[PDB]
From a paper:
The fibre protein interacts with the host cell through its distal, carboxy-terminal, head or knob domain. The TAdV-3 fibre protein has 454 residues, of which 1–45 are probably the tail domain that binds to the penton base, 46–303 form a putative shaft domain with fifteen triple beta-spiral sequence repeats and 304–454 may form the head domain. Here we describe the crystallographic structure of this carboxy-terminal end of the TAdV-3 fibre and confirm it as a globular, trimeric head domain which, surprisingly, most closely resembles the structure of reovirus fibre heads. We compare the structures of the virulent and avirulent fibre heads, and show that, in both cases, the head domain can bind sialyllactose.
The model was also independently refined against data collected from crystals of the native, non-selenomethionine-containing avirulent and virulent forms, and here manual adjustment resulted in a model containing the same 138 residues plus ordered solvent. The structures of avirulent and virulent forms are virtually identical (root mean squared difference (r.m.s.d.) of 0.53 Å when the C-alpha atoms of residues 317–454 are superposed). The largest difference is in the C'C"-loop, which moves upwards by up to 3 Å. This loop is near the two residues that differ between the avirulent and virulent forms, i.e. near residue 354 located in the C'-strand (Met in the avirulent form and Ile in the virulent form), but also near in space to residue 376 in the C"D-loop of a neighbouring monomer, which is Met in the avirulent form and Thr in the virulent form. The different position of the C'C"-loop can perhaps at least in part be attributed to the side chain of residue Ile354, which appears to push it further away. The melting temperatures of both the virulent and avirulent forms of the protein are 80°C at pH 6, which indicates the protein is very stable. The thermodynamic parameters derived from curve fitting suggested slightly different ways of interaction for the avirulent and virulent forms of the TAdV-3 fibre head protein, since both the enthalpic and the entropic contributions of sugar binding differ. The lower enthalpic stabilization of the complex in the virulent form is partially compensated by a more favourable entropic contribution. Both proteins bound 3'-sialyllactose with two- to four-fold higher affinity than 6'-sialyllactose, while the avirulent form of the protein bound sialyllactose more strongly than the virulent form (1.5- to 3-fold). In crystals of the virulent variant soaked with either of the two sialyllactoses, some positive electron difference density was also obtained, but not convincing enough to allow modelling.
Author numbering:
A (entry chain A), B (entry chain A), C (entry chain A): 317 to 454
Write the structure that this text describes.
Amino acid sequence: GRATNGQFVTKTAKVLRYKFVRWDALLIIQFIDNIGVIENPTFYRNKSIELRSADFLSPTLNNTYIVPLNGGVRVESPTIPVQLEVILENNSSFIQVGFVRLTVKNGNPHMIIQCNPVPGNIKMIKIKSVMLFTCLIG
Amino acid sequence: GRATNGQFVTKTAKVLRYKFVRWDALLIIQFIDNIGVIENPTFYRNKSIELRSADFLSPTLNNTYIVPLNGGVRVESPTIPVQLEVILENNSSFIQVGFVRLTVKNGNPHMIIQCNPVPGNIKMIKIKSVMLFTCLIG
Amino acid sequence: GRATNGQFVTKTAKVLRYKFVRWDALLIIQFIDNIGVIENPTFYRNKSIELRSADFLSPTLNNTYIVPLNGGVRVESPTIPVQLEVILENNSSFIQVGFVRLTVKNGNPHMIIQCNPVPGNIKMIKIKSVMLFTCLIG
């Protein structure tokens, strides 16, 4: 039981808030920055987690973006698929099914985001899904 | 422990049966209408949850279909991706990766279903995946 | 609590190792053969679970591959979406969002893998995602 607040922080000092439950064996963690809402009987708003070029390790292979993180938990999560929008520097954009994991390198957490080839360089990825990882410890 | 039966009901009085577990903090809920089966060593049958135009709020922006619901639980779920089939009025159809959440507007549960542009108007979405949401309460 | 080791075995005696937790009602199971790693600040390696033509039931309808299994647990899981790579006999390959379930036929576990049409016959599917199923018992 009850759901404890947490956060990561990115290179550019962006703060990714989450809630979790540790039950151990079991860690279940949800990002809470971008919970979509219905405004109007014609309109649902997706909110985004906005990650910029500066939050990624340069350089990138295989459209795999590594977002090194500080604080929060060190888990090897499963892969979850998400709704992405990838924003090129030329400001065209592509909707994609992305795939996200949490992983631990050195002493540190990282988010892995994997998407499809885009015809340009990337200024921003936005995650438009509400993300929850169910993790197994050890 | 053990798994309690529940249901929602749609505008057109369709009944979406599920099982759940509340452990609280934690709510884990599975839709049980469409559990696929192997009939024959050559054949697996996906079953569908069939949602019609009449179950959605008209009008729809961004290929986002809001299915207002009565009964069952009020949760803000994460987004899950699913296998959809979208059936146009002209009866062509498209397989898609859709994304589904549960959300709460006013006092009421809603299912959000988000898919890709189709070249026509929609008569039916069928969800062909077995859907389970792991939710965090509060 | 704590996470118990398990495995399935395929027709070709491939061994698919997993960890699980049974809490019952609740079974949460993770495949552990292919946990990706960061080697270098430019490189994350996806690992694959490699399933071959011989692990599937011939013949296949609807790009649905049935992998009959021995040992481990008998669950009807939800569908999870994954990163696939499908390798044709002509050795071209396609990245896809696949969908995987566990299911039980006769007395036996099966993995279901569902992907998109490919322009040829398949030698191998590789699952490149880290797969975790949260299951409800009964």
